[PDB]
Amino acid sequence: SKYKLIMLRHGEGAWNKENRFCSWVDQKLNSEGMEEARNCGKQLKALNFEFDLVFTSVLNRSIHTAWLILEELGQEWVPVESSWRLNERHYGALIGLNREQMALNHGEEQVRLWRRSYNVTPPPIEESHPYYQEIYNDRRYKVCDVPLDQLPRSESLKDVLERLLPYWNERIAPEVLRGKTILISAHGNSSRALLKHLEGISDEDIINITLPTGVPILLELDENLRAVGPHQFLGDQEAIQAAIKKVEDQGKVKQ
Amino acid sequence: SKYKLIMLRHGEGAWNKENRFCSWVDQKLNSEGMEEARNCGKQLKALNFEFDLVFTSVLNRSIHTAWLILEELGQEWVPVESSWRLNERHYGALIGLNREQMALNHGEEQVRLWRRSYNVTPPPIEESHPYYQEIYNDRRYKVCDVPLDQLPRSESLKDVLERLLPYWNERIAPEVLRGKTILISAHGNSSRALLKHLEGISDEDIINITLPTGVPILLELDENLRAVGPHQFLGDQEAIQAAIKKVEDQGKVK
Numbered sequence A: 001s002k003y004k005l006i007m008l009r010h011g012e013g014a015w016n017k018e019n020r021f022c023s024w025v026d027q028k029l030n031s032e033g034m035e036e037a038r039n040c041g042k043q044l045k046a047l048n049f050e051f052d053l054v055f056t057s058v059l060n061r062s063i064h065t066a067w068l069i070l071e072e073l074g075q076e077w078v079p080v081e082s083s084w085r086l087n088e089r090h091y092g093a094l095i096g097l098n099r100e101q102m103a104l105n106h107g108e109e110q111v112r113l114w115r116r117s118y119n120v121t122p123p124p125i126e127e128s129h130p131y132y133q134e135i136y137n138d139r140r141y142k143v144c145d146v147p148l149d150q151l152p153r154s155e156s157l158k159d160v161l162e163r164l165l166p167y168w169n170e171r172i173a174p175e176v177l178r179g180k181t182i183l184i185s186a187h188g189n190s191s192r193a194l195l196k197h198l199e200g201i202s203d204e205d206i207i208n209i210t211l212p213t214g215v216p217i218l219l220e221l222d223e224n225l226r227a228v229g230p231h232q233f234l235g236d237q238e239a240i241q242a243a244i245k246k247v248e249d250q251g252k253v254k255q
Numbered sequence B: 001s002k003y004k005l006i007m008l009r010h011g012e013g014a015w016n017k018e019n020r021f022c023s024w025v026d027q028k029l030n031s032e033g034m035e036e037a038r039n040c041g042k043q044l045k046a047l048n049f050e051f052d053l054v055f056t057s058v059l060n061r062s063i064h065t066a067w068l069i070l071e072e073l074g075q076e077w078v079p080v081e082s083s084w085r086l087n088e089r090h091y092g093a094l095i096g097l098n099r100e101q102m103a104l105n106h107g108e109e110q111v112r113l114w115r116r117s118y119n120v121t122p123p124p125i126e127e128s129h130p131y132y133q134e135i136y137n138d139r140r141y142k143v144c145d146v147p148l149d150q151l152p153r154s155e156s157l158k159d160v161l162e163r164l165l166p167y168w169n170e171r172i173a174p175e176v177l178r179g180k181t182i183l184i185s186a187h188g189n190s191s192r193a194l195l196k197h198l199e200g201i202s203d204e205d206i207i208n209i210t211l212p213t214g215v216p217i218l219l220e221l222d223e224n225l226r227a228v229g230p231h232q233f234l235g236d237q238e239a240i241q242a243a244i245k246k247v248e249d250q251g252k253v254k
């Protein structure tokens, strides 16, 4: 048999609009992002989606995106589970910095490696960093399945998959195999990590995969829980490609 | 007290304002109710509440109230569990009717009896009722711990307690005993049912308990999960008492 699930990157937030690496900083959705989430809900309603379970990260932007989708569907009663293992990749010291500024300071090539490569690790975030305290002082990280002191201070995409894969295999995949309809409301890089795994994308090719905010990602899996075909974006393809280009351009120098 | 928990009636919804028995009809919060929910969250934040688990009914007004509270607290990551066992009392055939109109036609005393009695069971809702279909055809009732055909068609407050108690005993009580800080976002009568149990209120006295929408209720329990004192509405008692009077007056002609 085959199974289909829906995954997506949270709706736009101020940091996305202002082009600043946000990562573990708990930014909220902005007005545009709330609309993106509601539109996702409307598309899923048009398709008559009936979710059984929803998985999100512990960053509120992914939770609110899910709540808006459920409201549009009239499915607010559907169980939601949130885990740090679906949190966006930890950008370390790059958190708070402007992506274009980094391109000007370090070059487009280096920024592309930091953003999309599989093995490159961002410099770790230090206690002196402006956003260190608010991240590690938050109670949500005192009750994780990993001690506060053991949580990452920066992550390569590979590091992300290493802490996300166990969650997928142990808590999400079993439900998929039970024929349940699942929604994964997450982030750009945590979603890219899962897609790399499910689609068998090489360490080299994953660098060219970019996900825009607020666009449902359709993925079909076979009996072995591997992608039957490439992931697909739901909606106007021209608009979606334009949004993808916008994300890519965040790390480029004006021309 | 050894333990403390917070419970509350969801924020104002369209039918609360229209003064119609809503019960299992899934009406949403209105602008006023959203504000009530947010003020609840602000009041709880002012008192340092840090929830570990949230329990709600499967009616969206209770869920949305919880979501707004969690947002105000910056605690959207806190686990939420929902169950039909926390659903508002099933008003049966009375669903959809205007409370004041009923008082005018049958007498204030009659309406008060239907609304607050512990033992009186409303007439069952039938297939000919305007809101029967949307209730029993909803998918949320196809995945309950009891078959769709077994779900109630009307309930007395006693009936409510009988189906709510198992959920309290099996799922909520154990968490409170572990020392977790719990939030229960429910309804007017389902909350009255739980208060009757926790405070050991008599069948006679429970009739005088009326709960206002969107007001946090603090319950202090001992080692045996018994209330050490009467429930405490958190906030200005004058305004809260006024909101309670508002609910009572829904069944009065004037």
Ligand SMILES: O=C(O)[C@@H](COP(=O)(O)O)OP(=O)(O)O
Residues within 6 Å of the ligand: A009, A010, A016, A020, A021, A022, A023, A024, A088, A089, A091, A099, A115, A116, A186, A187, A188, A189, A247
């Ligand atoms: O970490 C972040 O700032 C973004 C991704 O940024 P880029 O890797 O795409 O630059 O995560 P998201 O907006 O999905 O929560």
Ligand SMILES: O=C(O)[C@@H](COP(=O)(O)O)OP(=O)(O)O
Residues within 6 Å of the ligand: B009, B010, B016, B020, B021, B022, B023, B024, B088, B089, B091, B099, B115, B186, B187, B188, B189, B247
């Ligand atoms: O069933 C309803 O309409 C109300 C209670 O109405 P009364 O018993 O006070 O008339 O419950 P709610 O969902 O608003 O908390």
Ligand SMILES: [NH3+]C1CCCCC1
Residues within 6 Å of the ligand: A093, A094, A123
């Ligand atoms: N001072 C900055 C150098 C580039 C990586 C992020 C920190």
